[PDB]
Each structure stands twice: as structure tokens, then as C-alpha cells.
Amino acid sequence: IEDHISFLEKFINDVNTLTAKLLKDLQTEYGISAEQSHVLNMLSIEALTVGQITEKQGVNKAAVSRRVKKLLNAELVKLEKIIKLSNKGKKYIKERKAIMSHIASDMTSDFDSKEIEKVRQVLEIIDYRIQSYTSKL
Amino acid sequence: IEDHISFLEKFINDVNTLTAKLLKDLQTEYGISAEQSHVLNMLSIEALTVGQITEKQGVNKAAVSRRVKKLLNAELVKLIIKLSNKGKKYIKERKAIMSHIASDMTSDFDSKEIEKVRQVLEIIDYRIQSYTSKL
Ligand SMILES: O=C(N[C@@H](CO)[C@@H](O)c1ccc([N+](=O)[O-])cc1)C(Cl)Cl
Ligand SMILES: O=C(N[C@@H](CO)[C@@H](O)c1ccc([N+](=O)[O-])cc1)C(Cl)Cl
């Protein structure tokens, strides 16, 4: 009830702890820092400004800047202007989705796509609401 | 199933987005960065010796090392490293914000619906941890 908030916090912590570990090598192979990939996956969504990324993240603006340039030095992301992803950066995101999808299947081998449908409908609606709140200050 | 993973990925991204904005003013008011707040947030649960404090985040040796102490000074942390009273009070405040907003956002839902939501995230989390542990 405010216990769901905690669970949700724990659930997220776990996904990060897992995704981190699952993506270690690939990040090494790319030269990437964890916080850098999360920017790449953050842009995997479209294109954002360095303030947007800092404001959607909540870390020191300088740090976001230090990671945004390193991605342009590595040709992982390009510019419009705004900051898009480069193809090099895409094959990455693509190599990520592939590792994610392999494990997600194990853990969801025995589910009911109908069970899942309703649950997702409830989330898209919560997601919709979270976004509206965010825009207003 | 890739679209299911994209959504969860996005879903999370917003939650994180939103929590940041919603706590910014209060974290600034306590003089701490967001990153110092999960450090407290992880301790809202337990108390931890550096290793495990990093065992969840999994980032740098220095990132952990130069935020841990800051907090003792701000006086919201103790060493082990457990919460301090001022720290305990911060969380109380943090939980307020989060709960009112989450409530007033789920309010029109049939507990039955939300419950099946949590039950499917629990099964999913149960498998993650188990899998995590298998490294
Ligand atoms: O933006 C920053 N520094 C610039 C200028 O030196 C950048 O060159 C930089 C790159 C890498 C690192 N290093 O710590 O990973 C620091 C700074 C600040 Cl984090 Cl010091
Ligand atoms: O890896 C993270 N990065 C984001 C979360 O929004 C970043 O803004 C951030 C990192 C660490 C902490 N701190 O509380 O541990 C807060 C925020 C998690 Cl906290 Cl989700």
C-alpha cells in the first residue's frame, strides 16, 4: 500500500543488479561504463538533450557531460541539434536486447500471455500517469 | 517478448525519472545528491559494510568510497554503516512524498488488479534473485 513502493524499489534494485552483471563483458568490449550504457539505453528510446538526460537522471550535470562527450568520442551517439544514437551505438543496444531476451525467456517460460496482458495494461496506465506528473515541474 | 522488455525498461526509466524530480528539492534541502539517497535508501532496509553496499550498485571503488563518509559528516549515517537518527527521519520524509503520489495515482484501482500486478512482479523478482545468485 506504501509497501508496494518498497517492493517496487527492491524489484528495481534487483533488475539493475542483474542487468549490470549480465552486461559487464559487453560494456568492457565496448569501453563503456555502466552509467554510460544506461545513457545509451536512455537514448535507445529516441533522442535527448544533455539537460534532459541530467534532469531525467538526477546526477551531477558535470558527470552527465563527462559521459556524453565520451560517447561522441567513441562514436556511440551522434547529433541531430540534439543527441541521437549512432549505428555503432545501435548494434550495442541490439547486442543488449539479445542478452536480455535470452534470460527473460527462462524466467517467463511458464507464463500466461493473457495473465501478462492485463498486468501490462495496468502498467501502461500507470506509466501514462507517471509521465504526466513528470512534465509538470 | 522484446516489446515486453522494452516497456519494463521504459516503465522503470520513468519511475526513476519521477522519483528524482519528486525528491530533488528534499535532497537538496538535506544537502545530499540522489546517489547519496539510495545509499540511505538501501540502509532504510539494513545496514551494510562497503562490500555489499557495492554488491547491489556494482559501480566503481571510488564512487562508493567517496559518498559513504560524506553522509556521516552530514550526520545521517553511522559506522558496518547503519542509519543515524537524522538519516532515519529523512527516509520518513522521503516515504511520505512517494506514498501520497503513488496512492493518489493508483487510487482508482481495484486492489485485485494491483495485487495480481504485484504477484507477477514477485514471481519475476523471485526468479531474478535466484538467477542473479546463480551469478
Ligand atoms: O568533465 C570533466 N572532466 C573532463 C575534462 O578533463 C573530461 O576530460 C574527463 C574525462 C574523463 C575523466 N575521467 O575521470 O574518467 C575525467 C574528466 C569532470 Cl568529471 Cl572533471
Ligand atoms: O543506477 C541507478 N541510477 C539512477 C537512478 O535514477 C541515478 O539517478 C541514481 C544513481 C544512484 C542513486 N543513489 O540513490 O544510489 C540515485 C540515483 C539506480 Cl539508483 Cl536506478
Q: What is the DSSP letter of A78?
A: -
Whether B43 and A11 have beta carbons less than 8 Å apart is answered as: no
With a CB cutoff of 8 Å and minimum separation 6, the contacts of A116 are: B4, B120
Cα A86 to its chain centre, rounded Å, is 16
Q: Residue A36 burial by CB count (10 A; 0-12/13-18/19+): exposed, middle or buried?
A: buried
CA–CA gap between residue A71 and residue A92 (Å, rounded): 12
Of ligand 1's atoms, which has the minimum distance to the CA of residue A70? Answer: 10
Whole-number Å distance between alpha carbons of B40 and A86: 37
What is the CATH architecture of B1-135?
Orthogonal Bundle (1.10)
Method: X-ray
- List, in order, residues 6 or more apart from B68 with CB less than 8 Å away: B39, B50, B53, B77, B81
Strand partners, B83: B77
CB pairs < 8 Å spanning A and B? 140
Q: How is A9-26 classified by DSSP, letter by letter?
A: HHHHHHHHHHHHHHHHHH
Q: Where are the domains of chain B?
A: 1-135
Beta bridge partners of A83: A48
For A38, nearest residue in chain B (alpha carbons): B13
| Contact status, residue B4 vs residue A103, Cβ threshold 8 Å | no
Is A4 an 8 Å CB contact of chain B?
yes
Spacing of C-alpha A116 from chain mean position: 21
Distance CA A95, CA A45 (A): 16
Q: Whose CA is nearest to atom 10 of ligand 2?
A: B35
As assigned by CATH, the class of the A1-137 domain is mainly alpha
Torsion on CA atoms A125, A128, A132, A134, rounded to nearest 10: 110
Closest ligand to the CA of A31: 1
Distance CA A37, CA A99 (A): 14
Beta bridge partners of A34: none
Look at chain A and count its residues.
Answer: 137
The string over A77-86, giving b where at least 16 C-beta atoms fall within 10 Å of a residue's C-beta and e elsewhere, is bbeeeebebb
CA A39 – CA A32 distance, rounded (Å) = 10
Q: In chain A, which residue ranges form alpha helices assigned H by DSSP?
A: 4-30, 34-43, 50-57, 61-73, 87-107, 113-135
**CA-to-CA distance for A131 and A115, rounded, in angstroms?**
25
Residue A56 with chain B: CB contacts under 8 Å: 13, 17, 20
In angstroms, what CA-CA distances link A122 with A125, A129, B72? 5, 11, 41
Q: Are B38 and B57 in contact (CB under 8 A)?
A: yes
Cβ neighbours of residue B43 closer than 8 Å, sequence gap 6 or more: B77, B81, B82, B83, B87
B2, three cell numbers: 522484446
* Size of chain B in residues: 135
Helix (H) or strand (E) holding B78: strand B77-78
Pairing of strands B77-78, B82-83: antiparallel
> What 8-state DSSP symbol labels residue B31?
T
